[PDB]
Structures are given as structure tokens and as C-alpha cells.
Amino acid sequence: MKLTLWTYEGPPHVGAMRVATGMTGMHYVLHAPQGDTYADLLFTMIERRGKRPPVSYTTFQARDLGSDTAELFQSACRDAYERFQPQAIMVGSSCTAELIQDDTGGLADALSLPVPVVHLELPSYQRKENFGADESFLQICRKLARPMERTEKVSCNLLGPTALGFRHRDDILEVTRLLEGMGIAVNAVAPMGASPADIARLGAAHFNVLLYPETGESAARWAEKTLKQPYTKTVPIGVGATRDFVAEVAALAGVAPVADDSRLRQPWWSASVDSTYLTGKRVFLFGDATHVIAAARVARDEMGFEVVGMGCYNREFARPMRAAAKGYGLEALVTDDYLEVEEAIQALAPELILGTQMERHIAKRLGIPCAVISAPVHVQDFPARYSPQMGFEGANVLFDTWIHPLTMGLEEHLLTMFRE
Template sequence: MQLTLWTYEGPPHVGAMRVVTAMQGVHYVLHAPQGDTYADLLFTMIERRDRRPPVTYSTFQARDLGGDTAALFQTAARDAVARFQPQALLVGASCTAELIQDDPGGLAEALGLDIPVIPLELPSYQRKENWGAAETFYRLVRAMAPAPAPRSERGGRRARCNLLGATALGFRHRDDLREVRALLDRLGVDVHVAAPMGATPADLQRLTEADFNVVLYPEIADTAAAWLERTHRMPRTRTVPIGRRATLAFVDEVAALAGLDAFAAREALDWRADWYARSVDSNYLTGKRVFVFGDATHAVAAARVAAHELGFTVVGLGSYSREFARDVRAAAAEFGLEPLITDDYLEVEARIAELQPELVLGTQMERHVAKRLGLPCAVISAPVHVQDFPARYAPQMGVEGSAVMFDTWVQPLMMGLEEHLLHMFRDDFEFHSQATPSHLGRSGTPVAAEPVPAAAPEVNAPAAAPIVVPATAGAAAVDPQWAADAERELHRIPFFVRGKARRNTERFARDRGVALITVETLYDAKAHFSA
């Protein structure tokens, strides 16, 4: 076990909560102490849902451990069914309650309830949130699906599919679902059931009536879709439509499964970001160094979009999804990279600091890291904070998703250049903060402005020579200091590469025993590292 202040995934029971919160007519009774009820805030505060998740906690306390905690759980389960009248009941234990081994599944079965009771065995000390969500969805599908039967012919009706994988607290899942629905309708394919998001247990019983399954998020839906394929002979898609190329490949795959001609549908797609790729301004993006980290689905898709559609150079790729590490390694091999498979944010921060990319694509934590390092950043994957659950329509998948990603990724680079120019000229006599705004013209009255002080010239002062400390055996490395003029010159460097310039210069000075960094040292270091 590792003590940390940040985690990319919560315990597996949080994944179960994501599934039941997305659904309707399902309730989850969680054997948990009072402190584990924090998970409600993930949905009401961060995702800004208008209702609490359908979860009842047994909420035992320390004083209850000497008594019958099993009776507390049974009472909570019985009361939840009476109050909420669910179509199906899920039961399980939180990471803390797992230690007392009360067997929620057996306790719920002993109640003899008149609705399906689905026990969840989620090993909190071996698995994490996405695995918990996948296991929960799989158990629900398996419990609700009818017995295998021969598949009926389609006849003259339109092809129909299920959309699998969208959950609560997912990164843009709500909007992705809407975008893919519209894309499939344009292809001539009906959506039979979308699950877990918006589905009921009765809907899960109808899953096998569809012709095939569309797996939107493999981390959540792949286990259930694979079982449906094995047991009910329902084929599934393997392409996630994130980015232009992937969306076109997805259209081809769906058309093949539905027996349709995809050519007309491909031609009708309107890619609004294409004009920029043909413009002169797009040259500014070519070769920009980008680091990508997130869940496997979004990280791999983002890396391919960055490299193949925007002309970026992917210098780092990683994921916290250990269950999909093989897919991430295969994608990293396309770019000649060694992937970073870790759930330790400090390792990710160290890799970003080492690579010094020009753009970071990651989670909420990478946003913090990039801000600390002075690097542009865009969020592409959960976990995310409240600002990445927008009220507006902002998918990541399909045609509109490619436009949203384009805007989101390019903006930090473009605005970074503008911000650098503002910093660069902030001390200029014409543009300093107390100067009259240019749109007021000459008649404008400036705010009582004090003259901007200029550095007093040193009369007959010889140029400061670097102070060199002779290296002695066993002596500790000298921490170099910055001269005032060198510090001013450093601030003329764009802020998004300033940190790298500072570190390289200090390393150059330290290696040569230079105690005072001057302007000459700064440019000597630049020449050294540019060679």
C-alpha cells in the first residue's frame, strides 16, 4: 500500500457507483463505515448531478464492531428496497468493510427479496475503479440477459446496435453518447439500447435483440461485450471513434457489421478542422513536442490524433490503466517510445520535467503539473475536475469531437504565444500597465502614471566576468546565482520554454563551477545545448 495525496483511480466500489448512478431502476447497498460516504461528493459536487447516487450505506461505526455488523447491513438492504423500489439490487462492501468479511451477498440472499440481487466481489486491495466499473456492468448484463437462443434474421428492418460503456463521472460520456447516436443514425443504424447510461435492468434484458454491440469505452464495456460475443454470438466493434481517422475507420467497421455501404456516409461527414490543416498558420503546429497521459482509450487515441492529424511529435505516452497496458505499449511502439505505465503521479511529473514538451495532454493532475512547470496543457481523460463537466455540448468522439479536440489542444499553444508577447512588452514605454490604452487615441487621459524606472547605467563598469570556483575533489556542487541582467534576459524567453532554459543554464554553470550566471553564461549554455 502507498500513501499518496492523489490517485488516478478510486477503489473498485467507486467504479460500481459510477455504473449504478448512470442507470435507472438499480440500487446499490454498500457495507461501509461512516467515512466512506465521501463518494457521493464525486457525483454531486464534481459532476454536478442534480441527484445523489442511488447508494445506501450501512454506515457502521467503531462501536458497532463489537456487535453484529451483519444485522446493520441487512437492515439497510431491507429499508432500501422498501423505500426506493428498485428493479434490481446490487450489494457489496467498501475497501474498509472488506476487512471484516461480513459477506454482503450471502446476507442479502438470506433476506429472500422479491427482486434480483446481484452480489459484487470487488477486491479493493488488488483492483481499482475502472476494473470495478467493468466488473459491475458485466455482472449486471450476465444476471439480466436471457438464456442463449438462435439469432433471428433481420428481415427488412434497419440494423440496430447497442452502445456500451458510458457511465457517470466519465470524461464527456454524455456528449459522446449523443454524438455517436447521431453518427449511427446518419449511417442508417438504429440504437437499440445504450448502457449503462440511461438504461434500466429491463433494458439489459433486451441487449441480445440487437445485431451487434458498439464498445465506446473498452475499460468499462469490453468484459461485458466479450461475454455477449461468446455466449450470444453478438459481434462488437473494436475501433473507438476519437479523431478523424478513427471515426472513418469506425464508420467502415459499423458498415461492415450492418451490411451497409459506408461510402456515401463518409462523403457526407463535414470535418470543420480540415481548413486549418491546409492553411499557412498550421505550420506553427508542425513538430510541436507533446506528452500524452490518461486512461488507455483516450491516451492512445490522443497520441494518434496528435501525430497523424495535427502534425505534432509525440515524445511521451503513458497510462494508469494497467489492464490495458498491452494496448498502450503497442501504440507507443508506433512512435518509437517506451510507454510509462504507472499510477504514481510523481513518476509522471518527473517524466514531463525530463522531456520538457511544448504541450501536455493528460488528466486533472497533469494540468496541475503543467501549470507548475509553466507548460501549456489540455485535459483529455478522467479523472477530471468540475470544469471538465461543461454545461455545453463538448464531445470527444465523432465529427464534432474532432473539432472540440482541435480547439482545446491548439488554444493553449496559440494563447501561449500571445501571452509571451504581452509579457515581453509589459515594460515597454508604450505598453506598460500605466500607459494610456491605444484605443483612446492621443486625447485619452492616462491614469496617473509613474514613469517606468529604467535600469541605471553603470559608468565605466567593466563587464562582469563569470566567477569560476575551482573544482576540488569531494567538493559539493555550487548552486549558481543569477545576475540581475541575466534574470532580465531570461524573462525575454517565452514562458513555455523558460523553465527549460533556466534548468539548462544552471546545469551548464554547475558543471563548469560558475557561481554567478551572467548574460554571457546564458548564451553560452544555449549554444552548448543547441549544438
């Protein structure tokens, strides 16, 4: 009932559609009203997808109520199977669907299609988009990921990377190249590059890698007991986090660390003499949980900045948020409202703030240098150039991405003082 003008997330069916479009051979049926069909725009355009998202919508109207909704849903699923031919199918509901007495699971059972189906119960008014992605992930995992004999060579599974993710296409590549660095083979990358066969083979890994918590943590814990699959706890964003993750995976797989420091340049450039003025610069961080945790760690340790403001809209990870904030002796700001964080950056007045698009634009209003380090972004944040946020290369990317606003403002001020 609170007025929101800009929200940091989407309805949980958006995250479920993220995981659905990430992996191939799936189709996603919405019990969505006509006009709620917009949700494929963002996928076709913000992420710049050449293919239609594997989704079909019933698009019911005022004339279609009661039984007509059920018949329309049945026809939608039947035609989706007939013309799209998905290896795996799942049934979902929208915000309006659950209010109507339409049983998605009952309709799916009545269809009795040969391809296995799963019923996604989405609390579209209790929860948000990342939860929906995670629930779809664990539900598909229990549907068609069964325990089976280990691989000949130690294998890992990357859990977490979904569509509409921050750089996810690049983090999968960087992590994969690193793991080939120790030579451990990635059996399946899900849900970014998954398939029904891939989910079936997901149990073949000797351990799991939690590349993104918000979208793979519950799947990893489900594999913990269902498949006896250990999952790594450390996120490799930043040099120190990269080394911690390398040690963790080397321990789990039993292979030697064999880390490659050749391409890394961030420590030398941060210790470089031109980078002295970065020391003692206040920074405010907001956005995705692990992203903010790693950003604060990287800033305080390797950047010389002083974290002056910490926050997270991922309420489900407020506990790590609070723990880290206490670790830096800060006060976690878990608001999902742009106005509270706006007031926070007004009161604190950090030299630089790194959040998401909201933080970028409020800093533009406040005349403060800003960079984006979180999920909610416009089209231009997602680049064609490969920009990993994690790993040794990701260290340099993070470094100069943070540098750019600072040097821009600094040279602008130097110009202004100089023509005066």
C-alpha cells in the first residue's frame, strides 16, 4: 500500500522467467492477463536477446472468467507443446492468477502431457523476483535432477548464473577459465546454459560452486542432502576473494591451487603513485548482497577507500549484510525505497557512491561521482565487450570502472579552476 515510484526488483515470475529463458528446452506458461505480456520486452531488448523468450501467455480478459480461463490455459499449454516442442515444461502463475480460482497444477495434471511438468507456487505478493528464480531452480532440480554415478574426473556445477544477471555471461566465462586453470571440468552451467539433460547430469558433479547465492543457494542446499553435493561458500569477486575461492575449490576437489597471477594488474595500479589520492575517500555501497559485500571488502582492503555507507535491497540476505556492516562498523540500510537511500547519501555525503541505476541517477542529481555495481541497470550497462565482475580480470575491471567517475570529476574540477 506504500507508494513506490521506483522498485529495485520485479515480481517473482520475472525471476522465474529469467531462469526459464536462461536454459534451453524449457517453455514457461504464464496464467497472466493480457497486457502483462510486456515482460519479454526487457529480455528481448535490455539483454539484447536474438530469440523470443521461451514463454507463452494465456492473456485472459474480462470476458474470459471462470471456466474460460481454464480452457484458455489448457489450449495455451497444448499449442505451446505442439508448436514450440519443449523438452521440459513448467506451469506458472501471475499476480492476478492466484486471486482467481484457477489451479495451475490441476490444469497441468489434466493436460497429462508426456513431457514432465512442475507446478510453480509463486507468492507474488509476499516475495520478489530473485526468490522466484531460486524457487524455480530448486523445483526443476527436484523434478529432473536425480542422484547418479560420479564422473571419472572431478567435476563441478556453477549454480546461480541466470538471465538478466549482472555480467553473468562474463562471470561464467571467467570462472570457467579459472577452473580449467586448475583443470577441473565444469559438468553443467546452470541456469545460464542449462538443459533438461544438463539438469539430469547436474548430480554428476563432485561438488557445486555457488557463483551467485540469490539464485542458486537453495539449489545447492538441496543438492547437499539429495545428491550429497558440497557447495563452495566464498564468492570470488576481488583479488583476496579470488584467492579464498581458489583455496576453497582446491580443497574440495583436492587438486593443487595452481593460481595464475599473470594477467592481474589491479594491485600494482592501486599501489601506483598516481593512485595516492584515492586513500581516505568515503564510499557508499548499495545493491545486491554478495556484490555489496565484495565491493566493501575490495574498497576497504585493496582500494584505500573508507566504506561510509552500506546497504542491500536483497532482504533475504540482510543477515550477511548486517554482519559485514558490523565488520566495517557501519549501519546496514536494508530499505527497498529510493528515498531512504537518497536521504542516507544526503546525510553521509560520500565522495563516491557505487550502487545501481537509482544510485547513479541520484548521484547525478547530487553532483557526486557514481558507478553501477549491482543488478538493476539500463541497456547500456550490459556491454558487448566482455566485462567480468569476478576473478583476476574482474579485479582490473572493477578498479578502472570505479576510477572513471573519480578521474572524470577531478579533471572537470581542474578545468573549472583553470579557466577561472
